[PDB]
């Protein structure tokens, strides 16, 4: 009876809590601050090969192996500097959504409606590449999945809740629950000892990966999260919702800073990805195309519209050299 | 300018014809996505036809192959895994006629179907509509007025006429009928038909799509 | 893995033969297949490659014409068909696997060979240490002088250190000098620029007890090396 009044007053005292922090806009402090100007991009490498709307793809730690997934039901790895495949790893579930590339490359996870993250090692004395286990006991879609280790992977469904693998094993390590949508995004920090996970209730959480507990819980969006992605120095991320807005959230500040966001947008963020520096948020949308926006002094720079489907999924290498890009359309574009 | 590189471009190449092979493979196999309220209704029709989460029941009929996708064990948001199944061939929806009096659940039923219907990916996507449990409905009818489920059901308590109703305000959903075609079809648990009626409704679809190609329409 | 070669014996001198090499563990399809043979008291050298899937092969200039390879992916099999055998074609035969891509390892695994007895341009590989006796628990050096700058535009560099114990089959020790192969003891370390290339073993055991070969695959005309002998 009295545990729903104890709630609204907590509710009312973090919220007066972050607005006594709310001295100064964004761009208040960024007025003397130099605009970035125009940025324009080219499409250096066009990898054509899928047969399907590619839904996922990610980036592995020497900016040249690339990892894609789509619907076709294959795992094509891409040589950035030479657009060649490297392996094509048969799918026993066509209906894939996210992939990740472990950060040694070794591993390779996949996941999708099947509820199971199969796991694939790439360095084998065999010329195929072989399941090296399956993961099972999420009851929803996998939306992402992040690689800790080489014997730990982080895994969120569309059941509310997020898990921690323990790969050698197979069973889960850490169960990360508090959710009230299904979990569609998941970001870790560089130092992998915190992550920040996007789900349908215009809210996104954080975890730890020991203790396995809500430190702070962002809002401000007015719909479902579709996308995340941490901020390069690690103490803040972005986020992308259908409500045709993207918004940064800072750690240590505890709220919004600055939104972004265009009278002529009226469609959802898909994927969402950052700058070495940080100051260029790419921003991709249902128009068929991505953007670029100053993380400083809230300004769309420039397009990258060179896709005739919708863009899946976004990925800035670690050097922040050139930009890859998937789409339903079955290419995946690289941009510099 | 090229020492060992050939060796690579090779590989790549022999993979790409691999997939290449294994796209038109999968290219002349028919997908049907398998939806309905209740298990009641799915299972019957999936037991039905010939030879977790998702569950890919793949079935030969007349030299062409058939690939149902059902994902019932789904409780998540739909709207979040529904767009994968764009593409899909056509859309299997069963409801259960002996549901009315089991509560509500007939409702459901329309609500899913009105939602799947005039859905931003399914825009054109055929419905097939096998309205099963025809004995169980029939024998109920008489004892359950059907009233409790259409308070605007000034009939007959008959099968041949409240299943024609039902029909109706099943195919009344559709705010848009010159784009979508409904295959509304009455089965129950010994019709061994539905396969020959799922086998029409494809090659309708077929023929579509080649008058699109051919270069009409 | 497994490779067993067969076909060995004493041939006549201009008489034809086949040489079967079964291969077993691995997605025989998807490697690319070598022969290296080796005389009696002599260095490798290679003979014939064809890749995955039969879809280029290669023969040496010094024996080009004469040998016929070819592949059988359902029985996972490579025969070689050798014809006008001369006194040269005396050695013993290795069926050697190879993949290559980004990060590959090529010639990981070598065969245990056939022997063969017969009655009766090219980059040259300068290996001008032959045998060096060294005492255990002392850091070794082992260079590698080449006639053409293998570092190629790209920048890795293409050069093998294999090494062969005595009465067994080589194995690959190091691949493009700068990474090792899965299962070599990290105590082999390669330094290459320009033309010269160096391996450093820090420290000396018995199975390191070999003859070092030192093969330049920039271009497919492959020589090997000469040999640097060690002792226990």
């Known amino acids: 009876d009295q545990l729903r009044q104890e709630a609204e007053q907590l509710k009312n005292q973090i919220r007066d809590a972050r607005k006594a922090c709310a001295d100064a806009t964004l761009s208040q402090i960024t007025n003397n601050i130099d605009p970035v100007g125009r940025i324009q991009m080219r499409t250096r490498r066009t990898l054509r090969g899928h047969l399907a709307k590619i839904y996922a793809m990610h980036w592995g730690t020497d900016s040249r192996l690339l990892v894609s997934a789509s619907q076709d039901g294959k795992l094509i790895i891409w040589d950035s500097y030479t657009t060649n495949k490297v392996h094509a790893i048969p799918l026993r579930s066509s209906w894939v959504m996210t992939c990740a590339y472990a950060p040694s490359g070794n591993y390779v996870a996949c996941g999708g409606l099947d509820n199971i993250c199969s796991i694939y090692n790439l360095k084998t004395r065999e010329g195929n590449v072989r399941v090296s286990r399956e993961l099972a006991g999420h009851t929803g879609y996998l939306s992402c999945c992040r690689f800790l280790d080489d014997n730990q992977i982080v895994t969120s469904s569309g059941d509310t809740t997020c898990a921690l693998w323990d790969i050698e094993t197979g069973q889960q390590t850490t169960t990360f629950t508090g959710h009230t949508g299904d979990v569609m995004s998941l970001s870790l920090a560089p130092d992998t000892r915190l992550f920040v996970s996007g789900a349908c209730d215009a809210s996104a959480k954080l975890w730890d990966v020991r203790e396995g507990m809500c430190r702070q819980t962002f809002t401000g969006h007015e719909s479902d999260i579709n996308a995340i992605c941490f901020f390069p120095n690690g103490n803040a991320f972005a986020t992308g919702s259908d409500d045709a807005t993207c918004r940064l959230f800072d750690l240590r500040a505890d709220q919004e800073l600055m939104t972004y966001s265009h009278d002529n947008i009226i469609c959802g963020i898909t994927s969402v990805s950052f700058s070495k520096s940080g100051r260029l948020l790419l921003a991709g949308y249902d128009d068929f195309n991505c953007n670029v926006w100053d993380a400083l002094k809230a300004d769309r720079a420039g397009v990258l519209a060179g896709h005739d489907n919708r863009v899946s999924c976004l990925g800035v290498t670690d050097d922040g050299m050139a930009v890859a890009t998937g789409s339903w359309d079955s290419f995946l574009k690289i941009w510099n | 300018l090229s020492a060992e590189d050939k060796a690579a471009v090779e590989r790549s190449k022999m993979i790409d014809r691999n997939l290449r092979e294994d796209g038109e493979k999968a290219a002349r196999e028919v997908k049907l996505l398998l939806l309905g309220a209740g298990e009641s209704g799915k299972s019957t029709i999936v037991k039905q036809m010939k030879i977790t989460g998702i569950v890919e029941t793949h079935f030969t009929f007349k030299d062409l192959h058939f690939k149902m996708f059902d994902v019932g064990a789904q409780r998540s948001e739909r709207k979040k895994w529904i767009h994968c199944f764009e593409g899909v061939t056509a859309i299997i929806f069963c409801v259960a006629l002996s549901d009315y009096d089991l509560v509500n659940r007939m409702h459901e039923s329309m609500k899913l179907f009105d939602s799947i219907c005039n859905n931003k990916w399914f825009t054109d996507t055929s419905i097939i509509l096998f309205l099963n449990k025809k004995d169980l409905f029939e024998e109920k009818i008489k004892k359950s007025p059907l009233t409790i489920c259409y308070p605007e059901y000034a009939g007959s308590n008959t099968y041949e006429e409240a299943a024609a109703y039902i029909q109706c305000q099943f195919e009344d959903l559709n705010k848009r009928k010159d784009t979508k075609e409904i295959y509304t079809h009455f089965t129950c648990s010994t019709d061994t038909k539905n396969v020959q009626f799922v086998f029409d409704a494809v090659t309708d679809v077929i023929i579509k799509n080649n008058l699109k190609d051919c270069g009409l329409f | 893995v497994q490779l067993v070669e067969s076909g060995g014996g004493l041939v006549q001198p201009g008489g034809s033969r086949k040489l079967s090499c079964s291969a077993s563990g691995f997605a025989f399809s998807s490697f690319g297949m070598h022969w290296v043979r080796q005389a009696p008291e002599k260095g490798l050298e290679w003979v014939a490659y064809?890749?995955?899937?039969?879809?280029?092969?290669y023969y040496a200039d010094t024996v080009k014409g004469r040998f016929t390879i070819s592949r059988d992916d359902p029985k996972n099999t490579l025969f070689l068909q050798m014809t006008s055998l001369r006194s040269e074609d005396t050695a013993m035969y290795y069926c050697?696997?190879?993949?290559?891509?980004?990060?590959?390892?090529?010639?990981?695994?070598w065969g245990q060979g056939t022997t063969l007895t017969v009655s009766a341009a090219d980059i040259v590989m300068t290996q001008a240490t032959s045998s060096v006796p060294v005492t255990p628990g002392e850091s070794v050096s082992i260079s590698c002088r080449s006639s053409?700058?293998?570092?190629?535009?790209?920048?890795?560099?293409?050069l093998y250190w294999f090494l062969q114990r005595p009465g067994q089959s080589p194995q690959l020790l190091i691949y493009?000098?700068?990474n090792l192969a899965s299962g070599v003891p990290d105590r082999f370390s390669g330094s290459g620029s320009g033309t010269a290339f160096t391996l450093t073993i820090s420290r000396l055991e018995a199975e390191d007890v070999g003859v070092y070969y030192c093969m330049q695959h920039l271009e497919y005309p492959l020589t090997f090396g000469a040999g640097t002998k060690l002792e226990l």
């Open positions: 493009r000098m700068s």
């Open positions: 064809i890749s995955s899937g039969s879809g280029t092969i």
């Open positions: 053409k700058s293998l570092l190629h535009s790209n920048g890795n560099t293409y």
């Open positions: 050697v696997r190879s993949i290559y891509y980004y990060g590959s390892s090529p010639f990981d695994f």
